Design a protein around this ligand. Structure first.
Ligand SMILES: *[C@@H]1O[C@H](CO)[C@@H](O[C@@H]2O[C@H](CO)[C@@H](O)[C@H](O)[C@H]2NC(C)=O)[C@H](O)[C@H]1NC(C)=O
Ligand SMILES: *[C@@H]1O[C@H](CO)[C@@H](O[C@@H]2O[C@H](CO)[C@@H](O)[C@H](O)[C@H]2NC(C)=O)[C@H](O)[C@H]1NC(C)=O
Ligand SMILES: *[C@@H]1O[C@H](CO)[C@@H](O[C@@H]2O[C@H](CO)[C@@H](O)[C@H](O)[C@H]2NC(C)=O)[C@H](O)[C@H]1NC(C)=O
Ligand SMILES: *[C@@H]1O[C@H](CO)[C@@H](O[C@@H]2O[C@H](CO)[C@@H](O)[C@H](O)[C@H]2NC(C)=O)[C@H](O)[C@H]1NC(C)=O
Ligand SMILES: *[C@@H]1O[C@H](CO)[C@@H](O)[C@H](O)[C@H]1NC(C)=O
Ligand SMILES: *[C@@H]1O[C@H](CO)[C@@H](O)[C@H](O)[C@H]1NC(C)=O
Ligand SMILES: *[C@@H]1O[C@H](CO)[C@@H](O)[C@H](O)[C@H]1NC(C)=O
Ligand SMILES: *[C@@H]1O[C@H](CO)[C@@H](O)[C@H](O)[C@H]1NC(C)=O
Ligand SMILES: *[C@@H]1O[C@H](CO)[C@@H](O)[C@H](O)[C@H]1NC(C)=O
Ligand SMILES: *[C@@H]1O[C@H](CO)[C@@H](O)[C@H](O)[C@H]1NC(C)=O
Ligand SMILES: *[C@@H]1O[C@H](CO)[C@@H](O)[C@H](O)[C@H]1NC(C)=O
Ligand SMILES: *[C@@H]1O[C@H](CO)[C@@H](O)[C@H](O)[C@H]1NC(C)=O
Ligand SMILES: *[C@@H]1O[C@H](CO)[C@@H](O)[C@H](O)[C@H]1NC(C)=O
Ligand SMILES: *[C@@H]1O[C@H](CO)[C@@H](O)[C@H](O)[C@H]1NC(C)=O
Ligand SMILES: *[C@@H]1O[C@H](CO)[C@@H](O)[C@H](O)[C@H]1NC(C)=O
Ligand SMILES: *[C@@H]1O[C@H](CO)[C@@H](O)[C@H](O)[C@H]1NC(C)=O
Ligand SMILES: *[C@@H]1O[C@H](CO)[C@@H](O)[C@H](O)[C@H]1NC(C)=O
Lengths: 378, 380, 273, 184, 49
């Protein structure tokens, strides 16, 4: 009773409004919601050697390649620049504060509960449970940890350099910003950090969106309960979903696929008798060996250039994404944003940053209206 | 080296990549099959009764030590053009099987024995493959095969229904069905005999004189060796960066005992690069392994050259209980093997660093290294 | 008799002789397509203690190699002849096995069809059949010869339940006959069971001959279990002798971790494939 | 497609091109990625609403005239006159309507796929946003749509820049006339 | 193909194929940049909406 059916896509549920002359609608209740957002910040650095790749430990092939000029000095500067840009990308997003703040010893924030985001000292890595889940959900391919099977098949001049900022001091930055934004409000984003009780800060955040502080000062218990429930269920939503961190996985997989293709391109004749240098030297004699080696060399150059050609565009896109992430971190975290549909859906309240493998995750807190009634207005 | 990699006499503070390092091979080994008999090459060239083109004699050769350097004085060798296998680079190879085919043809048609050629001889008598590798040898034979009356000893086929596949014999005494009449052995009008003559006489000039040809077809492919050249094998060394000559397979690396399951019909091992990974011993039949020697890049950490002339080298992704601590001549590509390598030694996740002492202090770092590690110039 | 059957997923062999592990390397070569017909064939010669001529062993074309599958008791199927017109007009082959010997050769036999039927060939009483070769009667213009180990080394499970399935593949691409074979005694009664197995090359030698015909040699002097009927055109009938043709195809083979072959995918069967 | 653009239906050329290795798997993957990105680009811009709102049956918005932007029911395509003028102004070349003379001569492996979002539901999306923004103000982009008379929303948008609502409530006629003249 | 034998027809066809490959790579090379620019414009338009 199962089949494949082709239909016409439906835009959405049909709805109508009841616009008139003297009718208005006003909600009598609200609801706090917590969404999530994933942004890549960087990609894996790499370095490629011409001599080992094009002409494997052979003197004649290297001598012939020398005649071509500076087609490999050009292919190192681009990769070094890409590596420098990748190293700089992670600094702008995270290294925003000047000092590192400590969380207070006693954890009581007027009913608000922050155990899911605060660091857990029991674990050796000192990472939050959500941070640990995000770290475990993403499978890394290579990290350059003195590996000495596919990665071991890359003794062809291809290496992966490790990032300058390890994923142990990034968590320190995340904890510093989160402690600063939960113990001083937004005052530490401009000048010195000034202490303020959390309920007063939340009351001012409500006053920012045009709702007087008495709403909070009379519904504190309900607001705290809703915040706790949302924070609890966001972890379950992240865990039970099939695949939410798809962008980071795609970024990880693209470089691996490109490297695998580049390795496999060595197994090409390129219009030659064979694809191995030792045989084509031993069997032949230097006259025609020069022509065949020139064919192989030009084929390998043509295959190698496209790699950096695509890497430049990928680096540009990743840099644009990193700039967007840095702007978002500056605006949603270190202040309240009045931009519509920028820092989550709905009226913005505040945000929390988290670190993910090769990226960042934002936890926006938003205010949404609820059941409404009509009235007659003049 | 840093001053040389970028054209200037002053280098600014920072880290620069200069070149690559890799250990060098120490000794070379060769291992070939141990065959003593000499397979005969005299009679294939030296025979007086080479068969005709429509049925050419084929000689197969087997285990021997073929010396391809004595046959040159066996014939004038009018044409000695060889295909992909170099004629001079032929005494140092190993082949699976070798074949020789012997026949005599008209000299004018000598050029027609080649891949991708049709005509008369190459469409009904003898065909070669397009990707043939080997040699051909053709020379004049008018001195012997010459009759004052007529040399009616060699024949060829004129009429056939379809072209034959390469390397195929099609001997047959039939009658061709030319025209509409299905002749049944009359061999008269409109039904001619498929075979004609090779009347060779000294009166005719060049091209019409008989030409004697012999073709050699090789089997240079991945298979157990049967025919090899005259070279003397040596002993096996293991766990050392050496160069090997395994049955015509030339390369370098470290050989160690492996745990593979090479079946009796398997001789070579492969990964996804079209490069060999495992090899079988030609004369002991033990499964070996091949691993490329250690290699990596070099980074030089230097302050301002106007401040000091001291540098610290970094080897990337090389764990230096290995050759960086045990350094010797003719073992490192950088000729500058002149560091102590016993003092000022640090191990780092991004490859171990030589030339710096760890200090438990912590400041803002000037020259990044990696893995949360930085280097800087500092007083006592 | 003759009958049709489904080949299922059988007839895959190691293409090259190099080692691999955990690789999904794909190749293009002559192969037996999945889910085709295999046409059975049965030669019938036994009746009481009287002649009952058979006129068995018909001609079968030999194009693009042939896949072989039969369950012989010990050596009931012995040899195969290859050539054209089986007369002194064009050369033909001679392939036949022995206890431990093989005498395959290239020649121009005028004829060798001497089955020498026995008046008491009924096997249930006696199976006296010794030195019943009656081949290589005449040789006109012949020089090629070859003797070596026979192709098959049979094994017995001390009962007829473990019937051997001698899966062979024959090809003649530029000479060097490939005789890929494998013994799989695990059959228990069902024809062409669901499963998977590979084949390995054994012998290679080039001769040069067109071979537009294939036939078998049976133990006509001592044969049994040959029921007769008019089965034809996609019907059923006990033959215990299969023949299949091969075509050039593209396959995707999944090499096992140890180095064997576990699964294969045909690239020209279904759009999903 | 390489196998026809490069080597036109030639077996020898195909076999000789196979020696270059995996060189057109990339040329197909990149183009497929480009097409996927193009399909994704037009979804983020327009699909900003959850429900397709409808314009009210009667059209009286306190003197304002929205006939030039609101959909025209008379036309078969249900497109606004301004949208119709924009469509007529631009002369699109090819859109993938089973073309089967320069376009017909590009049968060398070069094909133009059609977009997933046909140019009839994009107008539906635009009408939905227009109705939701002229019948409920700005509150339908944050939560549930709440109705509000258009002059009150006018006073709200004037108050948001620093001008009190009495200016609108005393100059409504002039403001409506100016808006009508501009939109005309 | 018709006016020549396979041997040097091979090298001529290699010339033609490599020329066409070089002519074909630049198309996608420029198309990637054009697509990136269009994506940036689309992001700006989405933010503006
Ligand atoms: C506003 O909405 C909240 C939604 O939770 C209401 O809280 C619920 O109130 C009902 C009735 O008192 C309780 O049975 C539920 O248990 C409450 N929810 C939770 C999570 O405890 C709240 O009452 C609403 N406010 C008004 C004025 O109607
Ligand atoms: C709210 O914070 C409290 C502690 O400040 C958490 O309470 C315990 O948390 C552990 C951790 O999983 C649980 O095993 C206990 O069952 C909790 N005890 C009680 C009495 O709640 C609590 O988990 C936090 N809220 C959420 C939603 O995690
Ligand atoms: C209060 O508002 C609701 C909608 O928010 C009104 O319900 C709809 O009103 C329209 C106006 O005629 C009707 O066409 C719909 O059929 C109503 N919906 C349903 C489900 O009946 C409701 O009428 C308003 N009440 C008052 C008194 O204005
Ligand atoms: C303003 O709205 C009115 C309707 O309320 C429009 O009135 C007519 O619109 C049609 C449409 O083409 C014209 O042909 C008529 O001449 C208009 N009549 C009058 C009395 O205005 C009017 O067109 C709208 N204004 C504009 C600029 O379109
Ligand atoms: C709003 O007032 C105008 C003024 O005449 C009237 O025409 C219109 O019908 C009124 N709206 C409704 C829904 O009755
Ligand atoms: C080569 O030497 C080995 C000695 O280990 C011997 O077993 C082998 O038979 C020799 N090869 C031949 C062809 O005799
Ligand atoms: C072959 O060699 C013998 C002597 O070894 C010589 O007499 C004879 O002329 C040679 N024949 C040819 C065809 O070279
Ligand atoms: C190939 O088949 C044809 C079929 O008529 C036959 O006549 C010919 O003899 C065969 N070729 C050889 C070499 O026997
Ligand atoms: C290095 O310092 C000297 C002074 O000791 C100065 O003259 C020179 O310009 C400096 N060079 C650079 C590159 O800073
Ligand atoms: C690297 O060297 C250290 C030093 O003892 C050792 O602990 C580690 O196991 C080594 N790793 C490798 C891959 O050799
Ligand atoms: C630095 O700290 C380590 C422990 O982390 C200690 O063993 C050592 O003595 C300290 N001083 C050094 C390395 O000079
Ligand atoms: C086998 O052939 C018969 C007709 O001869 C046909 O009915 C049947 O479908 C064929 N089977 C397959 C698998 O092609
Ligand atoms: C078969 O032939 C034998 C030989 O003459 C004869 O004795 C026997 O009767 C024949 N069979 C029958 C059924 O007649
Ligand atoms: C075949 O086997 C039989 C019995 O073992 C033997 O007598 C005969 O000589 C063998 N054939 C050949 C050609 O050796
Ligand atoms: C079976 O064959 C034997 C010959 O070995 C013969 O003596 C006997 O009469 C035959 N018939 C029976 C019923 O045994
Ligand atoms: C083949 O043998 C026959 C004997 O009947 C003989 O007449 C003929 O000449 C022979 N042909 C060859 C090529 O040996
Ligand atoms: C594969 O190898 C493993 C260990 O190398 C062994 O345990 C297993 O039995 C092997 N599989 C076979 C022989 O099918």
């Amino acid at each position: 009773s199962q089949s494949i059916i082709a239909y016409t896509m439906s835009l959405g549920a049909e709805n109508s409004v009841a616009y008139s002359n003297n009718s208005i609608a006003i909600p009598t209740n609200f609801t706090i919601s917590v969404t999530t957002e994933i942004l890549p910040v960087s990609m894996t650095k790499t370095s490629v050697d011409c001599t080992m790749y094009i002409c494997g430990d052979s003197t004649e092939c290297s001598n012939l390649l020398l005649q071509y000029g500076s087609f490999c000095t050009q292919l190192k500067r681009a990769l070094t620049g890409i590596a420098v840009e990748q190293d700089k990308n992670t600094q702008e997003v995270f290294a925003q504060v000047k000092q590192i703040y400590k969380t207070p010893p006693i954890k009581y924030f007027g009913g608000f509960n922050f155990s899911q985001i605060l660091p857990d000292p029991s674990k050796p890595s000192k990472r939050s449970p959500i941070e640990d889940l995000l770290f475990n959900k993403v499978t890394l391919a290579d990290a350059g940890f003195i590996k000495q099977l596919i990665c071991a098949q890359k003794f062809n001049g291809l290496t992966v350099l490790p990032p300058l900022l390890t994923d142990e001091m990034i968590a320190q930055y995340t904890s510093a910003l989160l402690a600063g934004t939960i113990t001083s409000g937004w005052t530490f984003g401009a000048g010195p950090a000034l202490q303020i009780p959390f309920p007063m800060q939340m009351a001012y955040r409500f006053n920012g969106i045009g709702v007087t502080q008495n709403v909070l000062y009379e519904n504190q218990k309900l607001i705290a309960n809703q915040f706790n429930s949302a924070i609890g269920k966001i972890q379950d939503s992240l865990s039970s979903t099939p695949s939410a961190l798809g962008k980071l996985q795609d970024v990880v997989n693209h470089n691996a696929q490109a490297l695998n293709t580049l390795v496999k391109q060595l197994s090409s004749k390129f219009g030659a008798i064979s694809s191995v240098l030792n045989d084509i030297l031993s069997r032949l004699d230097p006259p025609e060996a020069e022509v065949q080696i020139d064919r192989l060399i030009t084929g390998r150059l043509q295959s190698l250039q496209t790699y950096v050609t695509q890497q430049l565009i990928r680096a540009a896109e990743i840099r644009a994404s990193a700039n967007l992430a840095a702007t978002k971190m500056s605006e949603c975290v270190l202040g309240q944003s009045k931009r519509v549909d920028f820092c989550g859906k709905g009226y913005h309240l505040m945000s929390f940053p988290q670190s993910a493998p090769h990226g960042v995750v934002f936890l926006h807190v938003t205010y949404v209206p609820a059941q409404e009634k009509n009235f007659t207005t003049a | 080296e840093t001053k040389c990699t970028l054209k200037s006499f002053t280098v600014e503070k920072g880290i620069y990549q200069t070149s690559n390092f890799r250990v060098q091979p120490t000794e070379s080994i060769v291992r070939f099959p141990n065959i003593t008999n000499l397979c005969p090459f005299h009679e294939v060239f030296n025979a007086t009764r080479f068969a005709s083109v429509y049925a050419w004699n084929r000689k197969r050769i087997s285990n021997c030590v073929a010396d391809y350097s004595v046959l040159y004085n066996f014939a004038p060798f009018f044409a000695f053009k060889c295909y992909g296998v170099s004629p001079t680079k032929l005494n140092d190879l190993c082949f699976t099987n070798v074949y020789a085919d012997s026949f005599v043809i008209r000299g004018n048609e000598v050029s027609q024995i080649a891949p991708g050629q049709t005509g008369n001889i190459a469409d009904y008598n003898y065909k070669l493959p397009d990707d043939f590798t080997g040699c051909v040898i053709a020379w004049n034979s008018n001195k012997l095969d010459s009759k004052v009356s007529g040399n009616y000893n060699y024949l060829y086929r004129l009429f056939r229904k379809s072209k034959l596949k390469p390397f195929e014999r099609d001997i047959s005494t039939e009658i061709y069905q030319a025209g509409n009449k299905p002749c049944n052995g009359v061999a008269g009008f409109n039904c001619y005999f498929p075979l004609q003559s090779y009347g060779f006489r000294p009166t005719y000039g060049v091209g019409h004189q008989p030409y004697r040809v012999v073709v050699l077809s090789f089997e240079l492919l991945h298979a157990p060796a049967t025919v090899c050249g005259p070279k003397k094998s040596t002993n096996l060394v293991k766990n050392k960066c050496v160069n090997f000559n395994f049955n015509g397979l030339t390369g370098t690396g470290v050989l160690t005992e492996s745990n593979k399951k090479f079946l009796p019909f398997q001789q070579f091992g492969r990964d996804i690069a079209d490069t060999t990974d495992a090899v079988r011993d030609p004369q002991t039949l033990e499964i070996l392994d091949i691993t490329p020697c250690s290699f990596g890049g070099v980074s030089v950490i230097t302050p301002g050259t106007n401040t000091s002339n001291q540098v610290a080298v970094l080897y990337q992704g090389v764990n230096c209980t290995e050759v960086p601590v045990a350094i010797h001549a003719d073992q490192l590509t950088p000729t500058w093997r002149v560091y102590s390598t016993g003092s000022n030694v640090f191990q780092t996740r991004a490859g171990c660093l030589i030339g710096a002492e760890y200090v438990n202090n912590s400041y803002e770092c000037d020259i990044p290294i990696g893995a949360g590690i930085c280097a800087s110039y500092q007083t006592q | 008799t003759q009958s049709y059957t489904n080949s299922f997923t059988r007839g895959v062999y190691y293409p090259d002789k190099v080692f691999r592990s955990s690789v999904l390397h794909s190749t293009q070569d002559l192969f037996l397509p999945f889910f085709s017909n295999v046409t059975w064939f049965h030669a019938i010669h036994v009746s009481g203690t009287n002649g009952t001529k058979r006129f068995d062993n018909p001609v079968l074309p030999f194009n693009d190699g042939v896949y072989f599958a039969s369950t012989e008791k010990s050596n009931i199927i012995r040899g195969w002849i290859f050539g054209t017109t089986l007369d002194s007009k064009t050369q033909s082959l001679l392939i036949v096995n022995n206890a431990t010997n093989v005498v395959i050769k290239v020649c121009e036999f005028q004829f060798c069809n001497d089955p020498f039927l026995d008046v008491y060939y009924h096997e249930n009483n006696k199976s006296r059949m010794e030195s019943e070769l009656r081949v290589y009667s005449s040789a006109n213009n012949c020089t090629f010869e070859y003797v070596s180990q026979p192709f098959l080394m049979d094994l017995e499970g001390k009962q007829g339940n473990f019937k051997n399935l001698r899966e062979f593949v024959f090809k003649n691409i530029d000479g060097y006959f490939k005789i890929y074979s494998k013994h799989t005694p695990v059959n228990l009664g069902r024809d062409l069971p669901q499963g998977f197995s590979a084949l390995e090359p054994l012998v290679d030698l080039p001769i040069g001959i067109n071979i537009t015909r294939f036939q078998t040699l049976l133990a006509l002097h001592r044969s049994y279990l040959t029921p007769g009927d008019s089965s034809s055109s996609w019907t059923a009938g006990a033959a215990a002798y299969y023949v299949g043709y091969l075509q050039p195809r593209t396959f995707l083979l999944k090499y096992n971790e140890n180095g064997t072959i576990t699964d294969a995918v045909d690239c020209a069967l279904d759009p999903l494939s």
